[PDB]
Amino acid sequence: GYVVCDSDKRFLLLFSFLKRNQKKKIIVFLSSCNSVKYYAELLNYIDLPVLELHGKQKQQKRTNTFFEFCNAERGILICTDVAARGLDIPAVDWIIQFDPPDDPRDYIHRVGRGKSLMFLTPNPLNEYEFPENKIANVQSQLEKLIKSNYYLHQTAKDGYRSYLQAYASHSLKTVYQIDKLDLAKVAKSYGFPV
Amino acid sequence: PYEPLIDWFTRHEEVMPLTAVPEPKRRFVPSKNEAKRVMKIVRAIREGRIIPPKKLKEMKEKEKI
Amino acid sequence: AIPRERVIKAVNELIKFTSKPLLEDDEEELKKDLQLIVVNNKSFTGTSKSFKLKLLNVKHSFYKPWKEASATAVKDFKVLLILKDSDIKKVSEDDLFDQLDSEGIKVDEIICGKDLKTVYKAYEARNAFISQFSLILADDSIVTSLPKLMGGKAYNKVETTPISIRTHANKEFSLTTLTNNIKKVYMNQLPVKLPRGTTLNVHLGNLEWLRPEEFVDNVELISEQLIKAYQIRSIFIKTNRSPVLPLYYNQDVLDEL
Amino acid sequence: RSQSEREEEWLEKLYKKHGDDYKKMFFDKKLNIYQQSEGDLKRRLLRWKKRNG
Amino acid sequence: NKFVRAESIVAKTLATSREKERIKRVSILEDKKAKNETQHIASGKDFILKITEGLIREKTTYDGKPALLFIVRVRGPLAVNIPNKAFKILSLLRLVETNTGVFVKLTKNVYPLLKVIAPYVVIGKPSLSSIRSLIQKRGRIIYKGENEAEPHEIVLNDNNIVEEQLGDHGIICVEDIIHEIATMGESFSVCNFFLQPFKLNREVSGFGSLNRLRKIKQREAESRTRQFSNAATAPVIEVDIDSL
Amino acid sequence: KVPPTIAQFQYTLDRNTAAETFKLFNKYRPETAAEKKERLTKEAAAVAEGASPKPYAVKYGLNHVVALIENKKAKLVLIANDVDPIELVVFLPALCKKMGVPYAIVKGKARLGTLVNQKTSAVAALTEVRAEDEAALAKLVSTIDANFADKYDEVKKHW
Amino acid sequence: EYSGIIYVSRLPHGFHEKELSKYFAQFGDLKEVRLARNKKTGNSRHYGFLEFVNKEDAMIAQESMNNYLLMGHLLQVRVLPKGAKIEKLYKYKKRVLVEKGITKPVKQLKDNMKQKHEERIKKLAKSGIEFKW
RNA sequence: CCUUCUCAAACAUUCUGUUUGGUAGUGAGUGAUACUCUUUGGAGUUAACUUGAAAUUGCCUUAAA
Known part of the structure; x- marks a missing residue:
């Protein structure tokens, strides 16, 4: 149904899932195609071998990687909302959209084709009670990791920005620029909101 | 004549930095000015016009006795 | 030598006790996993609270x-x-x-x-x-x-x-x-502390590791080294707050008290 | 126009470590300090290969 | 009469906590070494470290042989107040004053007491010239003044003063005192309490331009040429007294 | 008679806090021109015959600092009260308040110069810090926010 | 109003009644000083109370020590109103173990062990576990 | 505004192997059944977790001037 998490504990909770669910086939959805260019660099760097799908990469790569995910057994991909339209795989158990969606109505059609949940503190199936203590302590490791690579500083820069630009180009009363930037920055690990 | 300065603008703290200037590579990479100086002294040692710090001890171990 | 049959029966009862009818694993997984083998004595290191870890030799690695x-x-x-x-x-x-x-x-x-x-x-x-x-x-x-x-x-x-x-x-x-x-230390030894009191558990760890026939070899050699070095009272195999599994029970050490 | 005595020797260190794996080479820290991109790196390599093998 | 800052008053206690616990620890292991109850302790023997001059650290065991040491007062460590076990030993050796030397023989009874005072003293076996030059350069004698005054400590100027105070023990002159000090004899306990302590001048000996920098250079040379072991099996640091 | 944003100075940091500031700050000395030179000659001797991490030292140009506040790089800022044109700094305590950056007016413009190899400094700031002193800094900050920011909430008012 | 009794917290590691009495003595004649400690082992809870014979002395000490960075953690001092006196804080040293053991005969505790062991085998059967011997 | 108990033997040489001994810890709190002793008092143990070193009262002098 949904999980309630703050903008600090947002990617913290996501990273906590992907390590334990390495055996399974789960789907992570983002709003921007410039957000997945960050996550599919971090997780491949910290050795959770995820797959990368976005608009900014070439079509033959977009085909030959997504094909490999269909024929896999243990795999995991990161793809956007708009790029994953029409090509859905039954080989799935968790459909977990991370960002707020494009259409609040069309997402219902996206599910009933897998288990669905959202992430909302600023904003059928059951909610999920969440332990505060057992989140992974990889934040200061990431804070050291961001300010010492440049490439991951730039991809985080255009991860944070593109996410927040898509957050402002929404239509709902819930998703209308309420979330403070002192929390949203630590999702992409910053001392200042870029 | 002497009103207290009512801080009508500093009351509210800023979240983001003022400018969105992209950080340069050189702020993360080892400095190239340092590399320039080092590779200048390197030349000076090959030419023999700067005597190395290791031999400078040997020039005073033999002299001023 | 301890009976291996009662060790097999013990771990089988541990399998049955772990096979019983949240999105993170706060307590449920630890209480499922964590085996501890209790060793009792009349006053282990009775007056000195040193922090030495006794490296009990085991044939098979659980760290791996x-x-x-x-x-x-x-x-x-x-x-x-x-x-x-x-x-x-x-x-x-x-x-x-x-x-x-x-x-x-x-x-x-x-x-x-x-x-x-x-x-x-x-x-x-x-x-x-x-x-x-x-x-x-x-x-x-x-x-x-x-x-x-x-x-x-x-x-x-x-x-x-x-x-x-x-x-x-x-x-x-x-x-x-x-x-x-x-x-x-890694593959051939399991560390455990020695408290100044009476009770001592040995953190064997997760129940899921080393198929139960191997777990018998673990428990066997642990007893082979803890009863030889020290005179002891009682041994219990225990997953976190189970009705205990009395394994070894001695009546000749208490006579000296 | 040629390449520098150190630059060449630093390029030898890369090729003997990775060969033609520029991605791994670009994410290395021990040899690739000044975080030069693949295009910059491979250009230097193609040049170094022309004076050597 | 001055005000005492808070930082200092906590620093003194925080350092004496380390010193009280350290002295008790050495006291326990040395008590258990003498009673032959060596069942479960760190080490049941005695090492001596000899640091010479590029700084070679030797590790040699202490023999049962009686040796001749010249203990020199240091002032260390920083925030420490001396405990009861330090007050006692340094009273017996009469080394309450900083920059002050004394001669003692080192035996199996002397060596355990040496580990207690090791952060306060710098020890070592002197040579014949170190002893002989020290006595002919510095020397005090506490005896009566003109007619009334007692506490005059003057100087080893004469040999007839040596006659009047020692005499019948076989000692006649200052060089004979040097003999019974360099070579361990009968009259050593007689003359050792006759030259009570020595008055060594301090190193550098100033606060100013050159002297502060020279004190800085020597102060960093201290922690290199001397270590505080703090453990119950502290190897006794012996240094060159001919150089010092 | 003083307008409130002037003599928002003169209400400086106290004795015990001040020394403890320098206790931290003297740990972060920039290399001297002599030292920098010898370091590089040590490099040249070595690198002519046969790795390093980025070095923390405090930051010290008025420019550089006014860059650093407002960009969030700055953590602590030290601002000397007596300056030839006061105007050269009068905005600075407010700017910091506005970017939420912890600041303290220190006494002795020369005293800043000490910690930085220069004659004077007007302003120095500790941006980045070593691992061990990270806690030391953040506590100092709090200490400063108590005895300076909270103690003088009325520094923006009263002539 | 306020009273001579003071509250101090965030005390340094090893800043005890000896040094609370000695340092705050320089502010003036103190009446009565305590420090809360653990009973399991004799060490400070890093907070204590002390009283002055002068109320004005209490407020002067508070003015000068309210935010004092002292070896890794800043001293917090608070005045107390009329009432709320210094009551029950005891000097607790390191408490040592006492060896109360044998007294009962070996045959009594043996059959006590037999009783507890046979009931122990009769305990697993109460909740879904069957185990031999 | 000081910085912390930075290694010893007995046997064995497979280019280092075995055995023996060595550590008294910031405070405060959350915590699911077991262990022996004691005779009612907790005594001492046994998983785990929280936390900016957090907190409201359990009966020697040249390291100076």
Whole structure:
């Protein structure tokens, strides 16, 4: 149904899932195609071998990687909302959209084709009670990791920005620029909101 | 004549930095000015016009006795 | 010699007790996993509260699958090496990987005695440093100095308290003495503390590791080394707050009281 | 126009470590300090290969 | 009469905590070494470190042989107040004053007491010239003044003063005192309490331009040429007294 | 008679706090022109025959600092009260308040110069810090926010 | 109003009644000083109370020590109103173990162990577990 | 505003192996049944977790001027 998490504990909770669910086939959805260019660099760097799908990469790569995910057994991909339209795989158990969606109505059609949940503190199936203590302590490791690579500083820069630009180009009363930037920055690990 | 300065603008703290200037590579990479100086002294040692710090001890171990 | 049949029957009852009818694994998974073998005596080390970890020899490694699928678990297994002030000046991490990837163990971080008293001296920085790691190794010399440098919270567990490793061939440091002793502690030894009281549990760890026939060999040799060295009272196999499994029961040690 | 005595020797260090794996080479820290991109790196390599092998 | 800052008053206690616990620790292991109850302690023997001059650290065990030492007062460590066990030994050796030397013989009874005062003293076996030059350069004698005054400590100027105070023990002159000090004899306990302590001048000996920098250079040379072991199996640091 | 944003100075940091500031700050000395030169000659000797990490030292140009506040790089800022044109700094305590950056007016413009190899400094700031002193800094900050920011909430008012 | 009794917290590691009495003596004649400690082992809870014979002395000490960075953690001092006196804080040393053991005969405790062991085998059967011997 | 108990033997040489002994910890709190002793008092143990070193009262002098 949904999980309630703050903008600090947002990617913290996501990273906590992907390590334990390495055996399974789960789907992570983002709003921007410039957000997945960050996550599919971090997780491949910290050795959770995820797959990368976005608009900014070439079509033959977009085909030959997504094909490999269909024929896999243990795999995991990161793809956007708009790029994953029409090509859905039954080989799935968790459909977990991370960002707020494009259409609040069309997402219902996206599910009933897998288990669905959202992430909302600023904003059928059951909610999920969440332990505060057992989140992974990889934040200061990431804070050291961001300010010492440049490439991951730039991809985080255009991860944070593109996410927040898509957050402002929404239509709902819930998703209308309420979330403070002192929390949203630590999702992409910053001392200042870029 | 002497009103207290009512801080009508500093009351509210800023979240983001003022400018969105992209950080340069050189702020993360080892400095190239340092590399320039080092590779200048390197030349000076090959030419023999700067005597190395290791031999400078040997020039005073033999002299001023 | 203890009966192996009662050990098989014990672990089978542990299988039945673990097969019983949230999105994170806060307590449910630990109470499922964590086996502990209790050993009772009339006053273990009765007056001296030393923090020595008795390295009980075991045929089969439980640290190995603890590595392989702590990779899947949220809390990762990483190998720490506390050394002395001349060692890091002499030996890098790359030489450790050169000689320990051959069998397949990985040294995560090497740590000086300087680092625990300057950079990791802040209490939250210290706690969050050590609690990340499960295997704590310390060169023989530094071990006695370590209750002060890493504090008491590092000693409340069995994981976070260090293991005394010898690195000195006739007081001279050698890499080889480290290379083979890291192997012996890792695959052939299980550490456990000795409290000043009566009760002692041995943290065998997760029930899921080493198919129950192997678990018999673990328990067998543990009793083969704890009853020979010390006179003891009682032994119980216990998963977290089960009705206990009385394994060994002695009536000839109590006569001296 | 040629390449520098150190630059060449630093390029040898890369090729003997990775060969033609520019991605791994670009994410390396021990040899690739000044975080030069693949295009910059491979250009230098193609040049170094022309004076050597 | 001055105000005492808070930082200093906590620093003194925080350092004496280390010193009280350290002295008790050495006291326990040395008590358990003498009673032959060496069942479960760190080490049941005695090492001596001899640091010479590029700084070679030797590790040699202490023999049962009686040796001749010249203990020199240091002033160390920083925030420490001396405990009861330090007040006692330094009263017996009469080394309450800083920059002050004394001669003692080292035996199996003397050596355990040496580990207690090791952060306060710098020890070592002197040579014949170190002893002989020291006595002919510095020397005090506490005896009566003109007619009334007692506490005059003057100087080893004469040999007839040596006659009047010692005499019948076989000692006649200052060089004979040097003989019974360099070579361990009968009259050593007689003349050792006759030259009570020595008055060594301090190093550098100033606060100013050149003297502060020279004190800085020597102060960093201290921690290199001397270590505080703090453990119950502390190897006794012996240094060159001919150089010192 | 003083307008409130002037003599928002003169209400400086106290004795015990001040020394403890320098206790931290003297740990973060920039290399001297002599030292920098020898370091590089040490490099040249070595690198002519046969790795390093980025070095923390405090930051010291008025420019550089006014860059650093407002960009969030700054953590602590030290601002000397007596300056030839006061105007050269009068905005600075407010700017910091506005970017939420912890600041303290220190006494002795020369005293800043000490910690930085220069004659004077007007302003120095500790941006990045070593691992061990990270806690030391953040506590100092709090100490400063108590005895300076909270103690003088009325520094923006009263002539 | 306020009273001579003071509250001090965030005390340094090893800043005891000896040094609380000695340092705050320089502010003036103190009446009565305490420090809360653990009973399991004799060490400070890092907070204590002390009283002055002068109320004005209490407020002067508070003015000068309210935020005092002292070896890794800043001293917090608070005045107390009329009432709320210094009551029950005892000097607790390191408490040692006392060896009360044998007294009862070996045959009594043996059959006590037999009773507890047979009931122990009769305990697993109460909740879904069957185990031999 | 000082910085912390930075290694010893007995046997064995497979280029270092075995055995023996060595550590008294910031405080405060959350915590699911077991262990022996004691005779009612908790005595001492046994998983785990929280935390900016957090907190409201358990009966020697040249390291100076």
